[PDB]
Design an enzyme around this catalytic site. Sequence first.
Site, short mmCIF file in Angstrom:
data_model
loop_
_atom_site.label_atom_id
_atom_site.label_comp_id
_atom_site.label_asym_id
_atom_site.label_seq_id
_atom_site.Cartn_x
_atom_site.Cartn_y
_atom_site.Cartn_z
CG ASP A 25 -1.78 1.15 1.25
OD1 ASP A 25 -1.38 2.17 0.94
OD2 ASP A 25 -3.03 1.00 1.67
CB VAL A 26 1.88 3.67 -2.67
CG1 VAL A 26 2.23 2.46 -3.71
CG2 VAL A 26 0.50 4.30 -2.85
CB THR B 257 -9.65 4.98 -18.86
OG1 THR B 257 -8.53 4.35 -19.50
CG2 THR B 257 -8.86 5.85 -17.86
CB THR C 37 -5.76 0.63 -17.94
OG1 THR C 37 -6.22 1.77 -17.52
CG2 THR C 37 -4.37 0.73 -18.75
CE1 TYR D 114 -5.10 10.20 -12.28
CE2 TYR D 114 -5.40 11.77 -13.92
CZ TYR D 114 -4.91 10.66 -13.61
OH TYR D 114 -4.34 9.81 -14.36
CB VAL E 26 -3.20 3.91 -21.49
CG1 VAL E 26 -2.53 2.36 -21.72
CG2 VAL E 26 -2.33 4.88 -21.77
N1 LIG Z 1 -5.60 4.43 -17.50
C1 LIG Z 1 -5.10 5.86 -18.08
O1 LIG Z 1 -5.72 6.30 -19.18
C2 LIG Z 1 -3.92 6.68 -17.64
C3 LIG Z 1 -3.21 6.37 -16.30
N2 LIG Z 1 -2.08 7.07 -15.92
C4 LIG Z 1 -1.57 6.54 -14.67
O2 LIG Z 1 -0.85 5.51 -14.77
C5 LIG Z 1 -1.04 4.77 -13.24
C6 LIG Z 1 -1.41 3.27 -13.64
O3 LIG Z 1 -2.78 3.37 -14.30
P1 LIG Z 1 -3.65 2.26 -14.75
O4 LIG Z 1 -2.80 0.95 -15.05
O5 LIG Z 1 -4.56 2.47 -16.00
O6 LIG Z 1 -4.58 2.20 -13.32
P2 LIG Z 1 -5.20 0.94 -12.85
O7 LIG Z 1 -6.49 1.23 -11.97
O8 LIG Z 1 -5.08 -0.31 -13.86
O9 LIG Z 1 -3.96 0.21 -11.85
C7 LIG Z 1 -3.57 1.14 -10.54
C8 LIG Z 1 -3.08 0.09 -9.79
O10 LIG Z 1 -2.53 0.60 -8.48
C9 LIG Z 1 -3.01 -0.07 -7.36
N3 LIG Z 1 -3.50 0.84 -6.56
C10 LIG Z 1 -4.39 1.67 -6.03
N4 LIG Z 1 -4.28 2.08 -4.91
C11 LIG Z 1 -3.00 1.84 -4.45
C12 LIG Z 1 -2.35 1.83 -3.03
N5 LIG Z 1 -2.64 2.95 -2.35
N6 LIG Z 1 -1.28 1.32 -2.80
C13 LIG Z 1 -0.64 0.37 -3.62
N7 LIG Z 1 -1.21 0.15 -5.01
C14 LIG Z 1 -2.65 0.85 -5.25
C15 LIG Z 1 -4.41 -0.63 -8.01
O11 LIG Z 1 -4.81 -1.84 -7.19
C16 LIG Z 1 -3.94 -1.13 -9.50
O12 LIG Z 1 -3.54 -2.25 -9.78
C17 LIG Z 1 -1.72 5.58 -12.72
O13 LIG Z 1 -0.49 6.66 -11.65
C18 LIG Z 1 -2.62 6.46 -13.52
O14 LIG Z 1 -2.59 7.87 -12.93
C19 LIG Z 1 -1.85 8.33 -16.54
C20 LIG Z 1 -2.49 8.70 -17.70
C21 LIG Z 1 -3.59 8.02 -18.37
C1 LIG Z 2 -11.47 9.75 -18.52
C2 LIG Z 2 -10.31 11.12 -18.41
C3 LIG Z 2 -9.27 10.70 -19.42
C4 LIG Z 2 -7.90 9.88 -19.21
C5 LIG Z 2 -7.54 10.06 -17.82
O1 LIG Z 2 -6.15 9.77 -17.27
C6 LIG Z 2 -8.36 10.63 -16.51
C7 LIG Z 2 -9.79 10.93 -16.81
C8 LIG Z 2 -10.46 11.36 -15.66
C9 LIG Z 2 -11.58 12.61 -15.77
C10 LIG Z 2 -12.49 12.61 -16.90
C11 LIG Z 2 -11.48 12.76 -18.50
C12 LIG Z 2 -12.59 12.58 -19.75
C13 LIG Z 2 -13.55 13.91 -19.65
C14 LIG Z 2 -14.36 14.07 -18.36
C15 LIG Z 2 -15.25 12.61 -18.62
C16 LIG Z 2 -15.31 15.16 -17.98
O2 LIG Z 2 -16.15 15.59 -18.99
C17 LIG Z 2 -15.93 15.16 -16.39
C18 LIG Z 2 -14.78 14.03 -15.67
C19 LIG Z 2 -13.54 13.81 -16.95
#
Ligand SMILES: NC(=O)C1=CN([C@@H]2O[C@H](COP(=O)(O)OP(=O)(O)OC[C@H]3O[C@@H](n4cnc5c(N)ncnc54)[C@H](O)[C@@H]3O)[C@@H](O)[C@H]2O)C=CC1
Ligand SMILES: C[C@]12CCC(O)CC1CC[C@@H]1[C@@H]2CC[C@]2(C)C(=O)CC[C@@H]12
Lengths: 244, 244, 244, 244
Positions: free
Chosen positions: B60-61, B190, B187, B152, B185
């Site tokens: 847990d970070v 999103t 995942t 965020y 991305v």
């Molecule tokens: N999904 C997206 O489109 C984008 C994601 N990011 C960043 O990339 C990183 C990972 O994103 P994703 O893989 O898409 O998210 P994700 O939800 O798939 O994975 C995040 C991971 O962190 C773990 N986690 C959550 N809270 C935690 C905590 N307190 N301690 C330890 N682990 C914890 C979760 O269980 C999960 O496996 C994040 O920092 C996110 O902000 C940045 C830009 C776009």
């Molecule tokens: C998913 C994304 C787009 C990718 C990401 O890393 C985070 C977010 C979180 C807030 C979202 C944004 C798309 C536009 C949204 C849907 C706004 O219109 C209200 C909340 C906003």
Amino acid sequence: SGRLTGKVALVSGGARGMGASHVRAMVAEGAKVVFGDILDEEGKAMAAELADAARYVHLDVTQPAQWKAAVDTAVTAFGGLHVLVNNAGILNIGTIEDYALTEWQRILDVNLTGVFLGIRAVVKPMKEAGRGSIINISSIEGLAGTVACHGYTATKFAVRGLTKSTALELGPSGIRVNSIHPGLVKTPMTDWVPEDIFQTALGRAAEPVEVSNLVVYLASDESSYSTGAEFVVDGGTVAGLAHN
Amino acid sequence: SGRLTGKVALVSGGARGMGASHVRAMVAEGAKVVFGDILDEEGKAMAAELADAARYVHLDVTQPAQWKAAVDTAVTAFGGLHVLVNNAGILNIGTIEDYALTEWQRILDVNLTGVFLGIRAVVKPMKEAGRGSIINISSIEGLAGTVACHGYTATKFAVRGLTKSTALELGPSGIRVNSIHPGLVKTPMTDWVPEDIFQTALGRAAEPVEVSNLVVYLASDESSYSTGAEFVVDGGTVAGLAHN
Amino acid sequence: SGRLTGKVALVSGGARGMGASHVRAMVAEGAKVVFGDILDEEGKAMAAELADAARYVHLDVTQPAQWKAAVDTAVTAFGGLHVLVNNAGILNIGTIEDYALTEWQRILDVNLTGVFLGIRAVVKPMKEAGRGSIINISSIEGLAGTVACHGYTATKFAVRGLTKSTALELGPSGIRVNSIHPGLVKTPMTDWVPEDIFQTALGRAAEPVEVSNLVVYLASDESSYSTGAEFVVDGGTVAGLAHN
Amino acid sequence: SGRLTGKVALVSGGARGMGASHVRAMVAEGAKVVFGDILDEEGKAMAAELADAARYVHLDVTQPAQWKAAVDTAVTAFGGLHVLVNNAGILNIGTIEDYALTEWQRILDVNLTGVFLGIRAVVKPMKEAGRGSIINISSIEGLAGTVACHGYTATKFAVRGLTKSTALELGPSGIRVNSIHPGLVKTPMTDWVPEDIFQTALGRAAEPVEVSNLVVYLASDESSYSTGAEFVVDGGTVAGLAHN
Ligand SMILES: NC(=O)C1=CN([C@@H]2O[C@H](COP(=O)(O)OP(=O)(O)OC[C@H]3O[C@@H](n4cnc5c(N)ncnc54)[C@H](O)[C@@H]3O)[C@@H](O)[C@H]2O)C=CC1
Ligand SMILES: C[C@]12CCC(O)CC1CC[C@@H]1[C@@H]2CC[C@]2(C)C(=O)CC[C@@H]12
Ligand SMILES: NC(=O)C1=CN([C@@H]2O[C@H](COP(=O)(O)OP(=O)(O)OC[C@H]3O[C@@H](n4cnc5c(N)ncnc54)[C@H](O)[C@@H]3O)[C@@H](O)[C@H]2O)C=CC1
Ligand SMILES: NC(=O)C1=CN([C@@H]2O[C@H](COP(=O)(O)OP(=O)(O)OC[C@H]3O[C@@H](n4cnc5c(N)ncnc54)[C@H](O)[C@@H]3O)[C@@H](O)[C@H]2O)C=CC1
Ligand SMILES: NC(=O)C1=CN([C@@H]2O[C@H](COP(=O)(O)OP(=O)(O)OC[C@H]3O[C@@H](n4cnc5c(N)ncnc54)[C@H](O)[C@@H]3O)[C@@H](O)[C@H]2O)C=CC1
Ligand SMILES: C[C@]12CCC(O)CC1CC[C@@H]1[C@@H]2CC[C@]2(C)C(=O)CC[C@@H]12
Ligand SMILES: C[C@]12CCC(O)CC1CC[C@@H]1[C@@H]2CC[C@]2(C)C(=O)CC[C@@H]12
Ligand SMILES: C[C@]12CCC(O)CC1CC[C@@H]1[C@@H]2CC[C@]2(C)C(=O)CC[C@@H]12
């Protein structure tokens, strides 16, 4: 090793300095390289050691006809063109008052118009291939200013902007455009400058291969989702505030 | 195929999404990886199919004690620690009025403090080893704003800044710190968002491996002269102006 | 009122659009203004309704001799020169392929070289007074890219950079140099463009006086500690990410 | 004189330093000011010399209840609230290793959460009035990094980002949000720091009134088209590259 296999690249200003380093680095990764410059002696010299995987051509980046010749060489000799590294450039200095208008025009032609001409010349073959990577070499002087460096700063900032507009336009065709911003690198263009002129976090100037590694990354398909972005390789200079 | 040979990495939030992708990508390049998360079932599951080159730990970070345990695991099981990928993070939304102060505090703890704790935990072994690479995962929301995305945006901007101050401080010890800013991305974080929510030049969302390729590059010694910098992998979004 | 009392300003491209608005706004604040342009009919027309506070001169920003004449007019007619507003500029568009090299050269001459020539022309009188304010008009296109807007984007980015290098050099002489980056403004240069082409937070295009207010602020001594900086007046466009 | 006539402003951390300067500058321009702080003695002292133009209230920016009390005071005593200057903040330093987690949390609460709480507290009255101006005080440390300044850098970068997301959300309601980034200013927070610690183009530290002038500009309706933007007042520091 083999990361650029099947890729054909065109490098401007590749007879020496970073350009030469980029040519060698890309060949080592399996790419076929056509490099141009105005230093024919040196150019033909290293075209001899790279042997059959490279080709040297005389190329003055300010002459559109020569760009076309360079592109034709790449396409007919290697079958296509997938990478362009706009590396050719010059450096001149001078305060606002005693900076010649001719030096100003000269640097605009080479550093800015030259980059634009290179892009215009490679879009056709890249669009036909449906994939491509254009790498524009700017500098940290394209991120912040320096005294008595008006022409250089203006053009490096311009190249940074040109990178964005062209990336947006070419994106739909599968072509990526990115800019590289290095700090002090050990080359003939800056061998008269003290290696610690910039405040860096790493405490040293860069070796040209360190910039070449970034060129290979941007030329490869590994960087497939990066376009219109600035990649900084300056040892931490622009990451900090100027202190005394 | 062996760009990370001899490197030991610690990845937070590596049980799924991009984190999982980074673990797999780094192992494929010859690295030994210790990945932590709070989803133990999934974590142990993939630790099994990576058994020989990876170790899963509950992490847990927001808990400094768990970070220390994660680091000890890496050092004793693999002999050292050279790479840290601060990937763990959460996403919550809400307008200024109806955004709970608890959600605000929660995102600050995980997305910002969590990143800081990870850096504090790995500096000791990295400083002894004399070489290191810390990769902080921000986002384009750390470059510009979005409506109803205050927590965020604030934390992603903070991570971007923390990357610079720590890079300057750790530079002299041979440790590099850089931030990655991806766009949309695919995942679980999103999957409810339409893949074309952002105006991109490439016209598509990114596959997680496309971001992993950048992680490998920053983890390797190829990026030796880049520190305190922002690496954007957003398909061109922030390179253009918002049009209608 | 009286915020620019005792100040003498030179405005390029002041016969219409924002330039005209700047002239009127500065006169209303007590400044003496010399404005130049290539539209002599319109120029002499408004010079007539501003009688004793302003002087019109023919000025093609690409001709250094005309800049000198403009400066001499200001100095002899009003006693000195404290403010320069590099406002003159043109806009042309086109894709990488069908964009004429002559249009490219033309925009470089006016938008970039023209700005450089103006700065060279005013440094002498400003350095003698030991004070001065140079205001370069860039745009948000000097911050991010736009499709088919390569010449304009390149020059606006360049002007942004030129602003920084000259600010560092002239700072010791008491001269400040800053750039203004407006979004869509209602003028003849963009009357063919839909007022909501850009995604803005304010939901509207700007009135030219809204940009003039910023010009007055930068021209006055109120902004005494700001130099080499970008002042954005775009209604929030570049503050957000491009969405669909 | 009378540029803020009819405007009611709330300034946090206004008992001394820049905050006090902002209060005095805004009153001199015709505004009614409610300023809060935790230094009650000094606060009540200067509340006395301004008379009925200024009201002092005890305000710990980390306590939402106190923010509400401050807002109620402004509304009932002066009829409304049009300007908010999030100026309160603290500074602590320390390297990554010996930086206490409590100091980290403390600076996050004051410098970041405090700013967020202030915005949440003023949106209601501003939205009813149809318009408003929120001014967040960041710093150049919110633009680049500094060694042993992790908490401060992180929060100043966050405030910069929070400014953008809130500007986009509040824009439709006629509320503008901008951030100010000053360099070294002569105040009790930095009287132990040598006035030339930063490389500046002007060669001097700033007087607090120089930053106040920018606060007045952003508080007035003159800056009607600027929102979500960074206004730098650092004498040229971030405009140049760090040299030796
Ligand atoms: N999904 C997206 O489109 C984008 C994601 N990011 C960043 O990339 C990183 C990972 O994103 P994703 O893989 O898409 O998210 P994700 O939800 O798939 O994975 C995040 C991971 O962190 C773990 N986690 C959550 N809270 C935690 C905590 N307190 N301690 C330890 N682990 C914890 C979760 O269980 C999960 O496996 C994040 O920092 C996110 O902000 C940045 C830009 C776009
Ligand atoms: C998913 C994304 C787009 C990718 C990401 O890393 C985070 C977010 C979180 C807030 C979202 C944004 C798309 C536009 C949204 C849907 C706004 O219109 C209200 C909340 C906003
Ligand atoms: N040396 C340094 O520290 C830094 C260099 N850069 C940039 O990297 C690029 C290459 O730099 P260096 O290798 O260090 O310089 P360099 O002087 O070693 O090489 C530049 C090359 O360009 C060629 N060239 C010059 N004008 C040309 C023209 N009109 N047409 C074709 N070729 C022409 C030259 O003959 C030379 O071989 C330039 O764009 C430079 O601005 C950026 C940041 C730092
Ligand atoms: N209209 C807009 O939305 C925006 C305009 N700008 C910039 O503001 C400046 C003024 O723009 P507008 O008033 O809107 O355009 P405009 O077309 O109304 O006026 C430009 C003026 O410059 C003069 N001019 C053109 N070429 C010249 C030359 N060679 N020498 C001297 N004068 C010359 C023109 O005759 C004209 O009066 C330009 O630099 C433009 O790029 C920036 C952002 C947005
Ligand atoms: N002094 C400088 O050179 C620079 C200062 N700044 C920023 O300007 C702001 C004010 O700076 P200075 O006047 O120089 O500092 P200062 O120390 O003189 O004043 C800060 C004020 O905030 C008050 N305060 C502290 N904690 C508080 C809390 N929890 N709730 C309410 N009020 C609280 C303090 O009592 C003090 O009067 C800060 O946000 C600072 O980060 C930014 C750039 C440079
Ligand atoms: C070499 C470097 C540093 C690396 C580079 O790419 C270009 C230049 C060009 C102008 C130089 C600058 C060091 C500082 C100088 C020496 C100033 O003090 C006057 C001209 C400036
Ligand atoms: C008017 C504006 C928007 C305001 C400005 O200062 C310049 C331009 C010039 C190019 C235009 C852009 C709107 C979007 C356009 C119309 C693209 O779709 C093709 C050319 C582009
Ligand atoms: C005062 C200033 C400079 C002005 C400001 O707003 C905050 C700080 C805080 C950290 C200081 C920095 C000067 C350089 C210092 C002294 C480093 O060398 C260690 C801690 C750093």
